[PDB]
Amino acid sequence: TYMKIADYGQLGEYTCDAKCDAEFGEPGNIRHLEGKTYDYRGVFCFNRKNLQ
């Protein structure tokens, strides 16, 4: 399991005088992720003599 910052987001910007619109802004995500692994699992066979 790993983490992926999806985005950062904005923070209320550049108001010279109080208009009280962009107070908190909007931040991003952290988006926890996962992932598995796989395997081959092969076989073969000879008898005793065609190999000897």
Partner: protein
């Protein structure tokens, strides 16, 4: 509608003997009505609306309104370092805020 001419001629004891015509009495009545308004401070002409930039006075900002609004209407302030306008319900009778 506030004061009829008949009240003048009856109180001032000139109903029988005029001692003055009517238009001169009209000019007199306007004169007597334009004298009490500014002597007592109380406004007159059915309501009025003044736009007036206020100037700071004092460290805590004593603000007197030059027209003493009615009794309770919120006065709005804006401009001059004041970022967002805000209301203010003032004193009735006095204008010191």
């Amino acid at each position: 509608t506030l004061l009829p001419l008949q009240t003048i001629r009856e109180h001032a004891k000139c109903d029988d003997n005029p001692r003055v015509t009517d238009d001169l009495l009209k000019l007199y009545r306007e004169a007597a009505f334009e004298a009490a308004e500014l002597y007592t401070g109380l406004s007159f002409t059915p309501e009025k609306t003044i736009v007036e930039p206020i100037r700071l006075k004092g460290r805590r900002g004593k603000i007197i309104l030059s027209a003493t609004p009615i009794a309770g209407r919120p006065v709005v302030f804006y401009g001059g370092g004041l970022g967002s306008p805000l209301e203010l319900i003032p004193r009735p009778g006095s204008n010191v805020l």
